[PDB]
């Protein structure tokens, strides 16, 4: 049976655009019903890497389970959670993606972070995250203290280092910075490692699924 | 240059405060990869709308963009005199980037009479064998005017050239120069040099003239 | 913040190579996120994209011009350049340099220049440059109306375009009209610049036009005296 996304795009649904919350829960589906120009997608602008592939891999799913891979209340004792954005407003108030967590400095430091997850389930786990690129060096230091940060994401079948590039993009939804979104499928028995000293839009909810 | 960008109309005229819409149609679906530029005479082209609908920093909120796929619209609400310009759409979907042919937006305003001035040749220029007589029409609307040179009450032709400024960004008028060029020899065999100006804003034609040597 | 300035306008001989440079201020041309672009507009036509270059080595040129186009980046001068071989009159145009910011969610790579220079006019001709001769258009009784007088400068017999005209070194802007040039039968260009001023200022205020003809590195000032 088709997956009805209403006014949301796959990106808005899978990242957890706050306006995509009322979507009814589904454990299986075949074919995703998406409008030609969905109103609610990447509310904070950025590049969604490998997006068409992700759309194809999620077109038919037999089992789908969202779980809190990095629980908000216990995973980030050394960092704060940003106030989100007006670009991702819900009910006239600034908010952010439900499935991601915008980490910011705690006090005068953004401490180095290392967070890992072992796929204890017997299904593949879809993990999503982002990398923030501020428009100015003032916003970079205001949020993350250090001027030159890195993000590192490594599994047994994934390894990538991300470097924020500070510059004004054309304004999109009143935002000249960007958050680039990435994902990988974590096979059972594999471990994913997140390392960063700034600019990490951390996973909060991941998805254990069986494709096809 | 394979994605053809077709704008409609190619030129329009509207009054201050009017709502203006410009349409852009690519030869194929470009999703939202569509930008709108504004180009004023002598100035750098300016990005107003990015990716179909995103207003850029410092651009007045009276500009907005809408559309996707194969139909896009730039709207100027409450058109202002400084909005005189040529507007281009540009697709960023396929390489090479391609622009529409442009839409020239002119301002409709009330009729304004030209003030008329005439300038005899300077002595320095006469010291070189050529006499240029310049007739000036300052700040008029509409653009259409008729300027006839009269030399000893004889209508001239073939020896004058006209130039017209672009529309003024503040008062939306035009200005015009008519330059009669003669050799110093031809210039000295005549006495009365007159510029006759006909324009909707003048109830009767206005003549400015001088007598050579006066 | 960022400023871009194309090299001075002027002539290129047919079949020879056009060379233009763009001076960049405010950011580094080595930055990985910025791309550097050239666009041109032939007289009375629209905009034609020429191509882009990244410092990281990514380039793309319009297939309509690819074989003739070479772009480069000069990190020591913080500039980038365009070279166009085998030019014909089809290459006479205003050339704009521009910067964009890589933004793959909303633009193809290198395809959205959002900060442009004002452009420089390149004329493909086998003729020689000629500086202008500047003559005064003096205010007189034939140039008054009642609290307003008109004066100006006649800028005659130059090649190629363009000429820029200022008044009193840029202090006088209100009421100035600098007309588009007309092509004369001699094949040289001519224009006039005029200004309307309070006639009460005639005997006291000084009026001088500054005529710049960059294609010949000529700058000329003419004082317009009442007469
Ligand atoms: C979700 O989509 C709706 C459109 O259906 C967005 O609502 C618009 O938001 C913009 C920017 O705030 C306003 O200019 C419009 O007037 C809004 N229209 C309506 C009908 O409300 C909403 O902002 C989107 N939200 C997210 C998080 O993407
Ligand atoms: C989509 O938005 C429209 C408003 O334009 C609303 O009426 C409709 O209920 C929305 N659809 C869903 C599934 O929420
Ligand atoms: Na990134």
Domains of chain A: 44-211 (3.90.209.20)
Nearest CA to ligand 1 atom 15: A39
- Using a 6 Å CB cutoff, which residues line ligand 1? A 7, 17-19, 39-40, 43, 88-89
User: Tokens for B7?
Assistant: 């704008």
Check whether domain B115-211 has CATH 2.60.40.10, yes or no:
yes
The CATH number of the domain covering residues in C133-223: 2.60.40.10
C34 closest CB neighbour out of A45, A167, A178: A167
Q: Which residue has the tokens 């592939």?
A: A53
**DSSP character at residue C147:** S
CATH architecture for residues B5-108: Sandwich (2.60)
For C227, other C-beta atoms within 10 Å of its C-beta total 9
Is A170 within 8 Å of B69 when comparing Cβ atoms?
Answer: no
Q: Closest Cα to residue C73, out of C59, C94, C85?
A: C59
* CA B19 to each of CA B6, B25, B64, B107, C180: distance values in angstroms, whole numbers, following the listed order: 21, 20, 11, 12, 30
Same fold, B5-108 and B115-211: yes
Three-state secondary-structure class, residue B111: coil
- Distance from C-alpha of C23 to C-alpha of C79, rounded to nearest angstrom: 5
C33 closest CB neighbour out of A42, A47, A167: A167
For C219, other C-beta atoms within 10 Å of its C-beta total 12
Mutate to test the interface with B, among A171, A175, A178 (most CBs of B within 10 A): A171
User: Tokens for A100?
Assistant: 């991601």
- Distance from C-alpha of B6 to C-alpha of B8, rounded to nearest angstrom: 7
Q: If you write DSSP's letter for every residue of chain A in order, what string do you get?
A: --EE-TTB-HHHHHHT-GGG--PPP-S-EESEE--SS-SBS-SS---BTTHHHHHHHTSEEEEEEEE-SS-HHHH-TTSEE---EEEEEETTEEE--SSEEEEE-BTTB---EEEEEE--SSSEEEEEEEEEE-SSHHHHHHHHS-SS--EEEE-SS-EEEE------PPPBTTBSSEEEEEEEEE-TT-EEEEEESS-EEEE--EEEEEE-
Q: Closest Cα to residue B95, out of C107, C6, A185?
A: C107
Helices (H) and strands (E) in chain B, counts: 2, 18
Is A45 within 8 Å of C114 when comparing Cβ atoms?
Answer: no
Contacts with C117 (C-beta within 8 Å, 6 or more apart), sequence order: B44, C4, C5, C6, C22, C96, C97, C98
- Distance from C-alpha of A120 to C-alpha of A122, rounded to nearest angstrom: 7
Question: What percentage of chain B's residues is helix, strand, coil (to nearest 5)?
Answer: 5, 50, 45
Sign of the dihedral through C-alpha A130, A136, A141, A146: positive
* CA A90 to each of CA A95, A98, A99, A130: distance values in angstroms, whole numbers, following the listed order: 6, 11, 15, 20
Helices (H) and strands (E) in chain C, counts: 0, 19
State whether the beta carbon of A135 lies less than 6 angstroms from ligand 2.
no
Q: If you write DSSP's letter for every residue of C37-59 in order, what string do you get?
A: EEEEE-TTS--EEEEEE-TTS-E
- Look at the domain C3-124 and name its fold: Immunoglobulin-like (2.60.40)
User: Tokens for C144?
Assistant: 């008054």
- Distance from C-alpha of B164 to C-alpha of C179, rounded to nearest angstrom: 6
* CA C207 to each of CA B121, C137, C139, C204: distance values in angstroms, whole numbers, following the listed order: 18, 11, 10, 10
B183 touches chain C (CB under 8 A): no
Determination technique used: X-ray
- Distance from C-alpha of B98 to C-alpha of B30, rounded to nearest angstrom: 12
- Distance from C-alpha of C55 to C-alpha of C80, rounded to nearest angstrom: 10
Resolution in A: 2.1
| In chain B, where the domains are located | 5-108, 115-211
- What b/e sequence results for A38-58 when a residue is b if at least 16 CB atoms lie within 10 Å of its CB, and e otherwise? bebbbbbbbbbbebeebbebb
Residue whose CB lies within 8 A of the most ligand 1 atoms, among A20, A40, A98, for a mutation test? A40
User: Tokens for B182?
Assistant: 């003669």
Query: β-strands C149-158, C133-137: how paired?
Result: antiparallel
**Whether the Cβ atoms of residue A203 and residue A101 lie closer than 8 Å to each other:** yes
- Distance from C-alpha of B54 to C-alpha of A177, rounded to nearest angstrom: 14
Beta-ladder partners of C49: C39
Q: If you write DSSP's letter for every residue of B32-81 in order, what string do you get?
A: T-EEEEEE-TTS--EEEEETTTEEPTT--TTEEEEEETTEEEEEESS--G
Which chains touch B (3+ CB pairs under 8 A)?
A, C
- Distance from C-alpha of C132 to C-alpha of B82, rounded to nearest angstrom: 32
B57 touches chain C (CB under 8 A): no
Q: Where in chain C is the domain with CATH 2.60.40.10?
A: 3-124, 133-223
Mutate to test the interface with B, among A167, A172, A173 (most CBs of B within 10 A): A172
For C186, other C-beta atoms within 10 Å of its C-beta total 10
- Distance from C-alpha of B40 to C-alpha of B106, rounded to nearest angstrom: 11
Write phi, then psi, for B31 (nearest 5 degrees): 55, -120
**DSSP character at residue B93:** S
State whether the beta carbon of A6 lies less than 6 angstroms from ligand 2.
yes
- A158 Cα to chain C: minimum distance (Å): 22
**Whether the Cβ atoms of residue C116 and residue C97 lie closer than 8 Å to each other:** yes
Strand order of the β-sheet with A151-154 is A113-118, A191-196, A151-154, A159-162
């Amino acid at each position: 049976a088709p997956l009805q996304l209403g006014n949301c795009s796959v990106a808005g649904w899978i990242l957890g655009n706050p306006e995509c919350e009322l979507l009814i829960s589904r454990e299986s589906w075949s074919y995703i019903v998406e409008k030609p120009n969905p109103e609610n997608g990447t509310c904070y602008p950025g590049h969604f890497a490998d997006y068409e592939e992700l759309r194809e891999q999620l077109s038919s799913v037999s089992s789908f389970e969202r779980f809190e891979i990095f629980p908000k209340e216990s995973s980030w004792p050394n960092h704060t959670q940003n106030g989100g954005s007006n670009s991702c407003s819900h009910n006239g108030e600034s908010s952010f993606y439900k499935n991601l967590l915008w980490l910011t400095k705690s006090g005068s430091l953004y401490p180095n972070l290392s967070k890992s997850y072992a796929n204890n389930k017997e299904k593949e786990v879809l993990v999503l995250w982002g990398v923030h690129h501020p428009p100015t060096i003032q916003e970079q230091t205001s949020l993350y203290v250090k001027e030159n940060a890195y993000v590192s994401v490594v599994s047994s079948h994934y390894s990538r280092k991300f470097t924020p590039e500070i510059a004004k993009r054309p304004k999109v939804r009143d935002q000249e910075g960007r958050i680039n979104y990435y994902w990988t499928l974590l096979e059972p028995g594999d471990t994913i490692i997140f390392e960063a000293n700034g600019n990490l839009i951390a996973p909060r909810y991941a998805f254990a699924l069986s494709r096809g | 240059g394979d994605i053809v960008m077709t704008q409609s109309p190619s030129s329009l005229s509207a009054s201050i405060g009017d709502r203006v819409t410009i349409t852009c149609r690519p030869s194929q679906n470009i999703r939202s990869f569509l930008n709108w530029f504004q180009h004023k005479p002598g100035k750098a082209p300016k990005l107003l709308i990015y990716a179909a609908s995103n207003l850029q920093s410092g651009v007045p909120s009276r500009f907005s963009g809408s559309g996707s796929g194969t139909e896009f619209t730039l709207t100027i609400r409450s058109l202002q005199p400084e909005d005189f310009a040529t507007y281009y759409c540009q697709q960023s979907y396929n390489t090479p980037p391609t622009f529409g042919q442009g839409t020239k937006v002119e301002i409709k305003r009330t009729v304004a009479a030209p003030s008329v001035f005439i300038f005899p040749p300077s002595d320095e220029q006469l010291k070189s064998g050529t006499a240029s007589v310049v007739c000036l029409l300052n700040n008029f609307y509409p653009r259409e005017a008729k300027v006839q040179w009269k030399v000893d009450n004889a209508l001239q032709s073939g020896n004058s050239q006209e130039s017209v400024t672009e529309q003024d960004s503040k008062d939306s008028t035009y200005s015009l120069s008519s330059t009669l060029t003669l050799s110093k020899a031809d210039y000295e065999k005549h006495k009365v040099y007159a510029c006759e100006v006909t324009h909707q804003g003048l109830s009767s034609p206005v003549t400015k003239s001088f007598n050579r040597g006066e | 913040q960022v400023q871009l300035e194309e090299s001075g306008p002027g002539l290129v001989k047919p079949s020879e190579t056009l060379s233009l440079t763009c001076s960049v201020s405010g950011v580094s041309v080595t930055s990985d996120i910025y791309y550097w672009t050239w666009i041109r507009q032939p007289p009375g036509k629209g905009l034609e994209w020429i191509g882009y270059i990244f410092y990281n080595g990514d380039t793309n040129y319009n297939p309509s011009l690819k074989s003739r186009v070479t772009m480069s980046i000069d990190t020591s001068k913080n500039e980038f350049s365009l070279r166009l071989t085998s030019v014909t009159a089809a290459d006479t145009a205003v050339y704009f340099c521009a910067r964009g910011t890589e933004d793959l969610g909303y633009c193809s790579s290198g395809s959205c220049p959002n900060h442009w220079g004002q452009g420089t006019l390149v004329t493909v001709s086998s003729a020689s440059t000629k500086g202008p001769s500047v003559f005064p258009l003096a205010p007189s009784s034939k140039s008054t109306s009642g609290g307003t007088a008109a004066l100006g400068c006649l800028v005659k017999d130059y090649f190629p375009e363009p000429v820029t005209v200022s008044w009193n070194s840029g202090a006088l802007t209100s009421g100035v009209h600098t007309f588009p040039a007309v092509l004369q039968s001699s094949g040289l260009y001519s224009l006039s610049s005029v200004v309307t001023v309070p006639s009460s200022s005639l005997g006291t205020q000084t009026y001088i036009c500054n005529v710049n003809h960059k294609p010949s590195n000529t700058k000329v000032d003419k004082r317009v005296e009442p007469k």
